[PDB]
Design a protein around this ligand. Structure first.
Ligand SMILES: O=C(CO)[C@@H](O)[C@H](O)[C@H](O)CO
Ligand SMILES: OC[C@H]1O[C@](O)(CO)[C@@H](O)[C@@H]1O
Length: 560
């Protein structure tokens, strides 16, 4: 019996949780206490099965069991095609109430009142709004969300304690979800082989002192974890994730010397810890690569005789000595090498055709290097908010078809890179910057995917996950684009704008900026600053009273 096996390793409180999440992800439109009920039957059923293995129906796969409960289009359909239906029905941008957080006291009132139903409503709300969210990490966000309600409601002021701590959570939230979203699309749209290469590369940076047979082992385990998570098999996902942790913590003199403190922590924490560890110090006296990947006579023998292992060794030896290269770059480097080997071994003097191989990395390394210096400067010379507006006009010009909210959301998150990365010392700038940019570009990739409107985006999104960034960078303004038709149903206003949070306040402006730029695809910096400055002036007026509602209306209409 599978269920039971999972109920035992995971324990109940986790089990109950992981099943809840899976139901929220499977059915994002369905009511809360409909799902809690479904979770309850299953848990109680899994107890009968935990008792007697033979108990009727306990031999059934998790898919059959979860699918049946769910069904109490996709249901008039049987396993395995049925499960594929739920998975294929997942929605990255679901029509659901923004999640406004009401008066704190009331949150402490519901928390101390009913504390199981209050953590279960948090899982349920994150999960249906983030249908690909790394299941085990959620549990960890839930532990912390409690620790915060527990340790603020019993304090002087509960607004000053809680809110910051809870804001720090929502942030880590977003970022973790976007990171997991990108692993799932690597597997789903591009297949295991690409993910494994990504893994080989990243782990090898983290664990440079570790050997290739050790990195491979961790790579199969890691990909197995994610395969299941991204496929919605959360229970096995959590189980196998815990096991990787038990494993890393036992062999940590074979893997890295940075695990001490992570591996003394409780299960939920250690995994989260391990996944964030600092790169270990790269080994002492390391032979340049050329040795066996260029100088050798068996070069072409080995690539023919064992390509995957061989190209595995390369990426690994190259990665372990470039913690200052982004994973994307190294993956490009790796592809450029296999491709070269491809032509050279086919020709009359292979050793000669391929000895210039390392000399085709030059331009590939250069491109990201400059781009990261240029805008890391523009941003010290501009600041985040002003940096975001610049990205916002650039990317709108590139792909003006994409929806405003997507444009605003992506571009702002693109701005968060200067802030996040440009502080770092140059040998950390690049993996930060570029590895961060892939996550936010994938967001755009998956947000646009629900309803494609721009073939320039569709193309860069399907061509190669690795090339995705350069593909976006190299785009220039869209001169085919039919300039947009000015609409009064826009710069219509809303005396609310006077009382918006600083965030919401910047978000309305940026949203107006997009519109603007979409109205004149070709327009100066100097004419946008002009038209924007007008709008700002108009708003500062009407936010000073008598009749704000009519002020906004007259000037709305007196711009009509
Ligand atoms: O690069 C790092 C190290 O901070 C992490 O972002 C890592 O890539 C992630 O934990 C695995 O998905
Ligand atoms: O994302 C990769 C990292 O996450 C873990 O698999 C645990 O989830 C660690 O083994 C690995 O270092």
């Amino acid at each position: 019996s599978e269920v039971a096996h999972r109920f035992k390793d995971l324990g109940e409180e986790n089990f109950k949780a992981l099943v809840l999440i899976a139901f929220a992800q499977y059915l994002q439109q369905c009511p809360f206490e409909d799902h809690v009920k479904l979770v309850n039957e299953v848990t109680e059923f899994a107890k009968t099965c935990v008792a007697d293995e033979s108990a009727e129906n306990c031999d059934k796969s998790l898919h059959t069991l979860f699918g049946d409960k769910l069904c109490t289009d996709c249901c008039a359909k049987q396993e395995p095609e049925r499960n594929e239906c739920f998975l294929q029905h997942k929605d990255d941008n679901p029509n659901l109430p923004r999640l406004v957080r009401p008066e704190v006291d009331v949150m402490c009132t519901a928390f101390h009142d009913n504390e199981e139903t209050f953590l279960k409503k948090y899982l349920y709300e994150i999960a249906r709004r983030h249908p690909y969210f790394y299941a085990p990490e959620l549990l960890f966000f839930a532990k912390r969300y409690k620790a915060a309600f527990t340790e603020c409601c019993q304090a002087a002021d509960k607004a000053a304690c809680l809110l910051p701590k809870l804001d720090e959570l929502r942030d880590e939230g977003k970022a973790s979800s976007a990171k997991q979203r990108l692993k799932c699309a690597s597997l789903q749209k591009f297949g295991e082989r690409a993910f494994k290469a990504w893994a080989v590369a990243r782990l090898s940076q983290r664990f440079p002192k570790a050997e290739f047979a050790e990195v491979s082992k961790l790579v199969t385990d890691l990909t197995k974890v994610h395969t299941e998570c991204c496929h919605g098999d959360l229970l096995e996902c959590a189980d196998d994730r815990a096991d990787l942790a038990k494993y890393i913590c036992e062999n940590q003199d074979s893997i890295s010397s940075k695990l001490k403190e992570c591996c003394e922590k409780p299960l939920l924490e250690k995994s989260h810890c391990i996944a964030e560890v600092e790169n270990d110090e790269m080994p002492a006296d390391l032979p340049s690569l050329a040795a066996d990947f260029v100088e050798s006579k068996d070069v072409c023998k080995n690539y023919a005789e064992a390509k995957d292992v061989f190209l595995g060794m390369f990426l690994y030896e190259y990665a372990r000595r470039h913690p200052d290269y982004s994973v994307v770059l190294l993956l490009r480097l790796a592809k450029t090498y296999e491709t070269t080997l491809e032509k050279c071994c086919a020709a009359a003097d292979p050793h000669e055709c391929y000895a210039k191989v390392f000399d085709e990395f030059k331009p590939l390394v250069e491109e990201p290097q400059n781009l990261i210096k240029q805008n890391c400067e523009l941003f010290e010379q501009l600041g985040e908010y002003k940096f975001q507006n610049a990205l916002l006009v650039r990317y709108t010009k590139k792909v003006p078809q994409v929806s405003t909210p997507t444009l605003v959301e992506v571009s702002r998150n693109l701005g968060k890179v200067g802030s996040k990365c440009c502080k770092h010392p140059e040998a950390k700038r690049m993996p930060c910057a570029e590895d961060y940019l892939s996550v936010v570009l994938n967001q755009l990739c998956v947000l646009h995917e629900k309803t494609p409107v721009s073939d320039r985006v569709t193309k860069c999104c399907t061509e190669s996950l690795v090339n995705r960034r350069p593909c976006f960078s190299a785009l220039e303004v869209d001169e085919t684009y039919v300039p947009k038709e000015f609409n009064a149903e826009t710069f219509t206003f809303h005396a609310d704008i006077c009382t918006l949070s600083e965030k919401e306040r910047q978000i309305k402006k940026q949203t107006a900026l997009v519109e603007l730029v979409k109205h004149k695809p070709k327009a100066t910096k100097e004419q946008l600053k002009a038209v924007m400055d007008d709008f700002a002036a108009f708003v500062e007026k009407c936010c000073k009273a008598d009749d704000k509602e009519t002020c906004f209306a007259e000037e709305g209409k007196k711009l009509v």
